[PDB]
Design a protein around this ligand. Sequence first.
Ligand SMILES: Nc1ncnc2c1ncn2[C@@H]1O[C@H](COP(=O)(O)OP(=O)(O)OP(=O)(O)O)[C@@H](O)[C@H]1O
Lengths: 49, 282
Amino acid sequence: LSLKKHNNELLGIFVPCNLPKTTRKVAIENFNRPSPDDIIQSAQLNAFN
Amino acid sequence: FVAAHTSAGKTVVAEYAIAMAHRNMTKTIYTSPIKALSNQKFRDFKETFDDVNIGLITGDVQINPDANCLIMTTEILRSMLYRGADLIRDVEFVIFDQVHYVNDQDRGVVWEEVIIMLPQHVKFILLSATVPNTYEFANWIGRTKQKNIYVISTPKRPVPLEINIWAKKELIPVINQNSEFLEANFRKHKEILNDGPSKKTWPEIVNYLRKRELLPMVVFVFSKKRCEEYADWLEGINFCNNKEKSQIHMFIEKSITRLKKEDRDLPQILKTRSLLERGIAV
Ligand SMILES: Nc1ncnc2c1ncn2[C@@H]1O[C@H](COP(=O)(O)OP(=O)(O)OP(=O)(O)O)[C@@H](O)[C@H]1O
């Protein structure tokens, strides 16, 4: 029962134990913005219809 | 398709195409039939554009192959297409300059093969002069590639030309700027004259035109040996006062540094240096 209530942390991606909420929020905010490929693909639409 | 007279501003179209490609983050390829013009156009584009990387691909050199703007020869593009290069997928515009010089036999097959092998996502820009066979090239391209192409032509030369005749220390205008022959002037030219140049002929012209503020001159002589004799006949004539000579000397000294020390003493280099200090060259 310990494993069932402790999922999404026992089997997740690595996040450091003592991470301040500010740093976590900054990390989350970066990935909510376009990736380098997204910007280039956005502009190429006008060229190749 | 642009077919305008010479010195009308055809290179403005290519610059705008390059700017459009830079704005859209795509690639452009520039091609000329003659390898001599590739270096000059490379230098001109490098001077003109500062935010756009320029590259060159010839049979002798290869500079910045990964740049967004590439200048190459037609055969280089043919080999690249045969190899199936991955950069072709990003190319938006291909520009062919001096199309009217491709009507040869060796220059004709490669141009047609390159046109045939190009993919369907590439647009075309064509520049040349006024030639009798203009609509056929555009029709063939638009039929083979199934693309819409517009043929644009200019009415007349932006700058007008006149034809004159020189005889016995004066100049007779015989054709005006409207390309209308003047019979009376030719008759007067026939009357006043009633073989080859003499030793006192080119001095008789380098002074008449100098005082008329029409100095920049190009003389066409159809002989390698006669040009040197004509240049040597001009003695005691200069155009550099005190600083132009020093600047030309510095430019020559810096330029020929790439040669070896014993290769800078050749008689041709010395004669060219001596002539260039006075504003005369062959
Ligand atoms: N609309 C314009 N008004 C004033 N000047 C212009 C205009 N268009 C071009 N020019 C000038 O013309 C000059 C050179 O013209 P250009 O080299 O394009 O002629 P060209 O047709 O390409 O000659 P060629 O037959 O050798 O290819 C440029 O320096 C440019 O400043």
